[PDB]
Design a binder for these strands. Structure first.
Lengths: 108, 136, 25, 70, 145, 126, 84, 68
RNA sequence: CGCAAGACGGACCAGAGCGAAAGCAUUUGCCAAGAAUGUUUUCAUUAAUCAAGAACGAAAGUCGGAGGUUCGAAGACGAUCAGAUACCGUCGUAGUUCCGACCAUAAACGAUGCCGACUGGCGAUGCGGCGGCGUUAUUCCCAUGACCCGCCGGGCAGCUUCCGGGAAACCAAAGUCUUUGGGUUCCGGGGGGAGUAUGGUUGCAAAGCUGAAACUUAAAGGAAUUGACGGAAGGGCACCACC
């Protein structure tokens, strides 16, 4: 029997059971240590509407609040939504996160 | 329509209660207290197709009317409260959240504040769909 | 699923034989 | 982020004093004098430093009146 | 609680906090610390306060964790109740409010727990006025004096 | 479009610049006629190409050194950088002192001059 | 390992910083100490890992405190090994 | 109550072209400047072949493009 | 805006911890239990592995009571489809929850017995102990707290290579094996027939444990490699493709 991954595709070490979590898209049961977790921080307002809201606001310099969403995906939904991609035999050993913009300034 | 006897240098502040997500958009303008309220318009009233009720322009066309009746009465400014469905569901805004704001602001109404309000459990009852969930 | 079904059809069949033999006596 | 209009430092400073706390009300005042708000004398920097040195002498903190004046 | 000739007079009912602020402080590689108490005022008002503490990402860590022992946490919770009962059991309804507006309450806890773990942040995310006494017109108009 | 030069051009272009560096100008037409005389290129269209790349190389060779081929004057300036640099003639500034725990080694090896002492704080990143 | 290292004769503490039962000869990592503070003017002798409260016959009645290993003394010097 | 009251015909001009989209490349993302506000800008989807610096005729700026 | 019922402990929560395994996250208290480390304390071989026999043992299921919000086998409808007893939508019983008895099974998976010895390097993390140039808390000052550096144990793991092994995938153990022997238990013999037949035993039931042959067949199976194929993923291209 060939073992594709040393970790069996999850973060279970020294533990017997792990509570399941529901996938955000398909409601499927997935172990918390197998679920693909994406933290999404977004402004409540889209970048285009920021000007119109600042002009109509009673306050000269209102700091817009942020949405904090912890998305939990099953492996199928994460592949379908292209959040995770297929990797070569060697590139599966790599655990570095892909570089994003750089940083949270301005355009991104 | 009779407004208050001064609003010349001040503003009168209503609460907008924008609803978010799919197959539906509400905009429901109320008092500060929220005890009593004014006109309430849906995207299912602007557009009939049973599939464009969550669309951007249906949400914009809604707020483009609601914002008229506000200023007609004397309500000139708006604090904003959001609502995504939540309750162990999607808990993420629909399309028609960004949309209605851009339309109602530029119609002429003032924006005072904005915030997120969503009903988020501290862990509660099992979600519809079963163990294997929806597929197809 | 396939093996789990082959074990199931033969389970109900075995149960029927028991009943049928218990019926015969 | 933190502050804006650095004039909010006075408010907090004033809010804590109504409770009777001069140890943190001051901290808030110092957290401003030393920060991105180094726009060399906005008009509100005098009332901040006047209150700051009143509390320094109301609790006795010279090494703070030094950093404040510095 | 009362209406007076086209002017509606108000009374305290409890404070709450925003979502985004409460969310932003919560993050990975910290240990969140929470406690509550039921408490009575000098008057007949009754309150049920909810506080919070977060561990500090320390002065010059090279470590990527800020986790604390369980023994240490239960001290911090005990001492966060002790402070918040002393200042609210004494000191009548109005003086409570006066301490919470600049947050003198929360700031006092931050320094008092500093020795056993430094901590940055203390806020009181909720207070819920559970019971309250009779209307008392004389005590009422004091607030709107 | 397209028309990316092949290797047959880039091979001989380098060669022709190395051994006839002097004859080159920076004009198209002059560099053509030189290639016609110092070699025979059996086509006409091929000749018009090899000249144009010889020209395009000769622009860059009048800046810093190219890494595909060599000329004489670059190997001159190579030698001039690689036999003395103006930075030092002294070794290194003649006197350099060291901090203790090096002094303890030198104590046990019969040396006892030209030192300083600083006993810098604990510890790594701290 | 450099795979040629000596093991007959070890370094004074660069090969005697090891665990005490992984040394060539087993040694304790503990010691005695001759004390005589003022709270109790007597030449007392006490083991480093006290394990129990050591009492005093003077004005004081405590000298030690057993922790998770060595023992935290007090405001009285009194120190020696001696030899071991 | 009856029909609707609508905004007047707007005019807005290209500042830059972004790239082509749609499922046959038939749509074109483009950035446009509002031509009355010089700090305002919206992204649009435009069908026809465009260059840069040409002016469009928008019926609304309520609508906004994303990707699909 | 208030009230009631039942269910449930988010984010924080991690190749982190504890437990023999199954498993175990709101507060506070009580009740008994355990590992590691420290020790110039005690006993003096009291040990290792195990037929018989014994305790615990997910979910579902069975029996008797309580409860029944939510989800939901069964069932009744609405669509999709030539057909559609399905995937999808609505409703909904048993069940899901708690108390007392049964049931002994799972990919109960690291698909890897337990105890002991020896054999590379490197950086981390949880716990205890010890050593230290210093910042930091408070009462002003070595109570013991936080951060920094190093050392010693045992624990969950990772990275690195002509240690060595392997059919290879891979593995500091699956290594120290034709140069074969440290101790001991369990278990395997081409593929089907079959976990069936049969008798024994346990169980209220459902079933569990124990377990053949006749006959049939020259392949079944593993990795591993090269192709082709994919209603797999990432790039690129064509008016015999599209717009």
């Amino acid at each position: 029997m060939t073992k594709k991954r040393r970790n069996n595709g999850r973060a279970k070490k020294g533990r017997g059971h792990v509570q399941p979590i529901r996938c955000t898209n398909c409601a499927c049961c997935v172990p918390k240590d197998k679920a693909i977790k994406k933290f999404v921080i977004r402004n409540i307002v889209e970048a285009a509407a920021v000007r119109d809201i600042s002009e109509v606001s009673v306050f000269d310099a209102y700091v817009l609040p942020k949405l904090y969403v912890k998305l939990h995906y099953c492996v199928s939904c994460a592949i379908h939504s292209k959040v995770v991609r297929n990797r070569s035999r060697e590139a599966r050993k790599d655990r570095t996160p892909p570089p994003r913009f750089r940083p949270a300034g301005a355009a991104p | 329509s009779l407004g208050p006897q001064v609003a010349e240098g001040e503003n009168v502040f209503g609460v907008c209660h924008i609803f978010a997500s799919f197959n539906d958009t509400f905009v429901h303008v109320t008092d500060l207290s929220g005890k009593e309220t004014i006109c309430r318009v849906t995207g299912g009233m602007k557009v009939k197709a049973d599939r464009d009720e969550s669309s951007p322009y249906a949400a914009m066309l809604a707020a483009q009317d609601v914002a008229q009746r506000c200023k007609e009465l004397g309500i000139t400014a708006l604090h904003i409260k959001l609502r995504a469905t939540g309750g162990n569901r999607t808990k993420t805004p629909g399309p028609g959240a960004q949309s209605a704001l851009r339309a109602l602001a530029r119609s002429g109404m003032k924006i005072g504040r904005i915030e997120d309000v969503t009903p988020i459990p501290s862990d509660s009852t099992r979600r519809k769909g079963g163990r294997r969930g929806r597929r197809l | 699923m396939r093996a789990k079904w082959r074990k199931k059809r033969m389970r109900r069949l075995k149960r029927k034989r028991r009943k049928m033999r218990q019926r015969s006596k | 982020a933190y502050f804006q209009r650095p004039e909010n430092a006075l408010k907090r400073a004033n809010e804590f004093l109504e409770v009777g706390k001069k140890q943190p009300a001051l901290d808030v005042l110092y957290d401003v004098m030393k920060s991105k708000k180094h726009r060399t004398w906005q008009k509100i920097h005098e009332p901040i430093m006047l209150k700051y040195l009143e509390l320094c002498v109301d609790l006795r903190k010279s090494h703070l009146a030094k950093e404040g004046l510095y | 609680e009362d209406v007076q000739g086209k002017n509606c007079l108000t009374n305290f009912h409890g404070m709450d906090l925003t979502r985004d602020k409460m969310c932003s402080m919560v993050k990975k590689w910290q240990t969140m610390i929470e406690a509550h108490v039921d408490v009575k005022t000098t008057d007949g008002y009754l309150l049920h306060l909810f506080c919070v503490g977060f561990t500090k990402k320390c002065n010059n860590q090279i470590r990527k964790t800020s986790y604390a022992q369980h023994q240490q946490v239960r001290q911090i919770r005990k001492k966060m109740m002790e402070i918040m009962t002393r200042e609210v059991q004494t000191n009548d309804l109005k003086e409570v409010v006066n301490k919470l507006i600049p947050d003198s309450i929360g700031k006092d806890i931050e320094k008092a727990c500093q020795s056993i773990y430094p901590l940055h942040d203390v806020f009181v995310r909720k207070v819920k006025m559970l019971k309250k006494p009779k209307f008392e017109l004389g005590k009422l108009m004091e607030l709107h004096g | 479009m397209g028309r990316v030069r092949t290797k047959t051009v880039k091979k001989a272009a380098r060669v022709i610049i190395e051994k006839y560096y002097t004859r080159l100008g920076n004009d198209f037409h002059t560099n053509k006629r030189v290639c016609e005389e110092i070699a025979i290129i059996p086509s006409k269209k091929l000749r018009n190409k090899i000249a144009g790349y010889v020209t395009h190389l000769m622009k860059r060779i009048q800046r810093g050194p190219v890494r595909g081929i060599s000329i004489k004057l670059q190997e001159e300036e190579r030698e001039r950088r690689d036999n003395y640099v103006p930075e030092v003639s002294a070794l290194d500034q003649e006197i350099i002192e060291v901090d203790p725990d090096t002094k303890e080694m030198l104590k046990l090896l019969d040396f006892g001059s030209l030192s300083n002492l600083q006993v810098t704080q604990p510890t790594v990143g701290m | 390992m450099p795979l040629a290292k000596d093991l007959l004769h070890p370094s004074p503490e660069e090969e005697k910083r090891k665990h005490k039962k992984k040394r060539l000869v087993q040694s304790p990592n503990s010691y005695f100490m001759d004390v005589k503070c003022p709270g109790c003017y007597k030449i007392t002798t006490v083991f480093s890992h006290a394990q129990t409260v050591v009492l005093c016959v003077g004005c004081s009645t405590v000298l030690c405190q057993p922790t998770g290993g060595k023992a935290r003394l007090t405001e009285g010097c009194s120190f020696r090994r001696k030899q071991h | 109550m009856d029909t609707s009251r609508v905004q007047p015909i707007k005019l807005a001009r290209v500042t830059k072209v972004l790239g082509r989209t749609g499922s046959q490349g038939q749509c074109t993302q483009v950035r446009v400047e509002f031509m009355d506000d010089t700090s305002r800008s919206i992204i649009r989807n435009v069908k026809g072949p465009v260059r840069e610096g040409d002016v469009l005729t928008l019926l609304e700026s309520e609508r906004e493009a994303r990707r699909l």
